[PDB]
Chains A and B, each alone.
Chain A
Amino acid sequence: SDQQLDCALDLMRRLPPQQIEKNLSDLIDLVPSLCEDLLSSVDQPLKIARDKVVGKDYLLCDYNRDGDSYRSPWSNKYDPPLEDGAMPSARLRKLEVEANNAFDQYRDLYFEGGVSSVYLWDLDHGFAGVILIKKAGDGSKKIKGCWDSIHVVEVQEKSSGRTAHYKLTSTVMLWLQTNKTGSGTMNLGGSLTRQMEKDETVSDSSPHIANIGRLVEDMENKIRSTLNEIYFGKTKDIVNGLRSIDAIPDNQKYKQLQRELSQVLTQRQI
């Protein structure tokens, strides 16, 4: 069933990312035993939820979920209401509060808006966390756009040293859509994933959040460049290779040449 998970992930890497939600659900119907593994390994468009007690939005992901409820990073409460929901330790919660505050500033500085959410959890010899960022563009423009950042970092703390091992796996989901007369419906979306690992010094001037922050920042700056290249560069070029508005100076050479090379195998095979 590990080949199954592998097959499940390959499939989601091929079906239209525009329908990740419906398809993931169906995928789970098909293989109910992989439900937990898929909810954690398959990135899906980020959903916003409202923390009523604090009057602030927060983002949803498998990492702040317990059963059918999600934990707000602001009030540290579950919604819908739960009785004994999974909570980080009091000490990790404090670091979680600080990580949310630091990334709120990070978000405002690079996205000038949108929503961010950070959730942490303890590990055997370290801890992990997920940094979520969602930014939607001008709802008044012909073309809609949305950026979803999903950063999962694993921190391996060293017994002696205060140098830690950081493993960051990041995915940026970029969605672009337009409903204009001349183009009908045009949807350019999906995501790119990158991974990075580094050993780093941990000190009072460069604590865990600073190290994670620097890694996230470098990661997003790199993925932003790749996104621009792939979305507006590569897919456009593939599009121009499918059709051309100007008459393509017909080429006999390639067809004449192919005839020559083909008969070689035909008059060679049987």
Chain B
Amino acid sequence: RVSDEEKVRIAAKFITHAPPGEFNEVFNDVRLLLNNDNLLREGAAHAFAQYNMDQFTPVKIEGYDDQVLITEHGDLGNGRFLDPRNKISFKFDHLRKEASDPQPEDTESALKQWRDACDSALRAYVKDHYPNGFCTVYGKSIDGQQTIIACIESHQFQPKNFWNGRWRSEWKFTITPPTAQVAAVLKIQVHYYEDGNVQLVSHKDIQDSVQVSSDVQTAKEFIKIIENAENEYQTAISENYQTMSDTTFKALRRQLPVTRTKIDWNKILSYKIGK
């Protein structure tokens, strides 16, 4: 018998896997399917948090002009997140759209030097390539090693026309002078659902070895790595679209029969070699 614990985990998986801009619909579906609000509240908060986090949910703090990215890296752990740019503390309410009642966050200021350079250096990259994009660079110490984590998010939601899309890119820069190592993952998800369910799910994992110089210098070196890698990724995607449409798709079903005219069903229902 499927225990209530198993049903809760199932409900949680569905909820955290909602496509971009459709969280509520999926949540309401699961809620009515689970049909047990007591069980639903067991993992709700955790579900909401995980979703917004892996979705790089762009949020606007009470009044900073702050579009900041909700990610794990910014998860304080107490129910609050970090805004490395404006550098405050903000409590994110998961149900409601807003996240308010901030707290100043005087920093460690150790890796911040790099952090602050990359951040607004990337902030330029984003404004140049993402129509409705936002970025958040994290300066942090990961078990001794210093790392810069730049997160980029971009989306377009048009539910009235039955479609939504979102871009997510995460670059981990681990410094080990003279030359450092790079690790990233690019992600794209598109959903079209008017009388159907079509989705583009794609992601690319990349690892690079980069030479580390100055502060404003290594930064521009990075924004360059990213720019080239993401342009290459996007390029490979438009190409794939081209082949799928002019080669793969046509190899599946013809537009017209080999006979080159619509089918003569009376002929199919009788016409024989002999018996």
Q: Is A156 an interface residue (CB 8 A)?
A: no
Contact: A239 with B248, CB < 8 Å? no
Contact: B196 with A193, CB < 8 Å? yes
Contact: A30 with B11, CB < 8 Å? yes
Q: Is A127 an interface residue (CB 8 A)?
A: no
Distance to closest chain B CB from A107 (angstroms) = 9
Q: Is A247 an interface residue (CB 8 A)?
A: yes
Q: Is B252 an interface residue (CB 8 A)?
A: yes
Q: Is B145 an interface residue (CB 8 A)?
A: no
Contact: B193 with A13, CB < 8 Å? yes
Q: Which residue of A lies closest to B169 (CB)?
A: A243
Q: Which residues of B contact A102 (CB under 8 A)?
A: 265, 268-269
A228-B249, A242-B130 known; A29 vs B6 contact (CB < 8 Å): yes
Contact: A183 with B240, CB < 8 Å? yes
- The CA of A180 and the CA of B167, in the complex, are separated in Å by 19
Q: Is A206 an interface residue (CB 8 A)?
A: yes
Distance to closest chain A CB from B182 (angstroms) = 15
Contact: A248 with B131, CB < 8 Å? yes
Contact: A16 with B268, CB < 8 Å? no
Contact: B167 with A242, CB < 8 Å? yes
A102-B269, A146-B252, A238-B156 known; A244 vs B196 contact (CB < 8 Å): no
Q: Which residues of B contact A207 (CB under 8 A)?
A: 269
A121-152 residues at the B interface, CB under 8 angstroms:
135, 137-138, 141-147
Contact: B202 with A183, CB < 8 Å? yes
Contact: B265 with A243, CB < 8 Å? no
A11-B33, A26-B14, A183-B202 known; A243 vs B230 contact (CB < 8 Å): yes
Q: Which of B14, B34, B128 contacts A15 (CB 8 A)?
A: B14
Size of the chain A interface, CB-CB below 8 angstroms: 87
- The CA of A241 and the CA of B167, in the complex, are separated in Å by 10
Distance to closest chain B CB from A132 (angstroms) = 14
- Encode A193-207 as 1/0 by CB contact (under 8 A) with B: 110000000000111
Distance to closest chain B CB from A157 (angstroms) = 19
Q: Is B22 an interface residue (CB 8 A)?
A: yes
Q: Which of B203, B255, B265 contacts A185 (CB 8 A)?
A: B203
Q: Which residues of B contact A147 (CB under 8 A)?
A: 252-253
Contact: A193 with B253, CB < 8 Å? no
- The CA of A96 and the CA of B253, in the complex, are separated in Å by 24
Q: Which residues of A contact B6 (CB under 8 A)?
A: 29
Q: Which residues of A contact B258 (CB under 8 A)?
A: 109, 112
Q: Which of B127, B199, B203 contacts A189 (CB 8 A)?
A: B199
Q: Which residues of B contact A240 (CB under 8 A)?
A: 238
Contact: A145 with B269, CB < 8 Å? no
Contact: A231 with B26, CB < 8 Å? no
Interface size class of B (residues with CB under 8 A): 35 or more
B233-249 residues at the A interface, CB under 8 angstroms:
233-241, 243-245, 247-249
- The CA of A248 and the CA of B200, in the complex, are separated in Å by 24
Q: Is B180 an interface residue (CB 8 A)?
A: no
- The CA of A27 and the CA of B7, in the complex, are separated in Å by 9
Q: Which residues of A contact B35 (CB under 8 A)?
A: 4, 31
- The CA of A264 and the CA of B247, in the complex, are separated in Å by 53
- The CA of A248 and the CA of B131, in the complex, are separated in Å by 8
Q: Is B257 an interface residue (CB 8 A)?
A: yes
Q: Which residue of A lies closest to B11 (CB)?
A: A30
Distance to closest chain A CB from B50 (angstroms) = 16
A11-B26, A31-B33, A143-B244 known; A242 vs B154 contact (CB < 8 Å): yes
Q: Which residues of A contact B32 (CB under 8 A)?
A: 3-4, 7
Q: Which residues of A contact B255 (CB under 8 A)?
A: 221, 224
Q: Which residues of A contact B232 (CB under 8 A)?
A: 182
Q: Is B205 an interface residue (CB 8 A)?
A: yes
Distance to closest chain B CB from A78 (angstroms) = 28
B128-160 residues at the A interface, CB under 8 angstroms:
128-131, 133, 154-156
Among all A-B residue pairs, the 9 with the closest Cβ atoms:
A184-B204, A182-B236, A192-B196, A190-B198, A232-B245, A210-B265, A145-B248, A183-B236, A11-B29
14 extra interchain contacts, Cβ-Cβ under 8 A, other than A7-B33, A180-B236, A210-B269? A11-B26, A16-B201, A29-B6, A109-B259, A112-B258, A146-B252, A174-B252, A185-B203, A185-B204, A193-B195, A228-B245, A230-B192, A231-B198, A235-B198
- 29 example contacts (A-B, Cβ-Cβ < 8 A) are as follows A3-B32, A7-B33, A11-B14, A13-B197, A16-B19, A23-B14, A32-B2, A98-B269, A102-B268, A137-B248, A137-B252, A143-B240, A182-B236, A185-B204, A186-B237, A188-B198, A191-B198, A192-B198, A194-B195, A210-B268, A221-B255, A224-B255, A227-B249, A232-B244, A235-B198, A235-B200, A242-B165, A243-B234, A244-B130
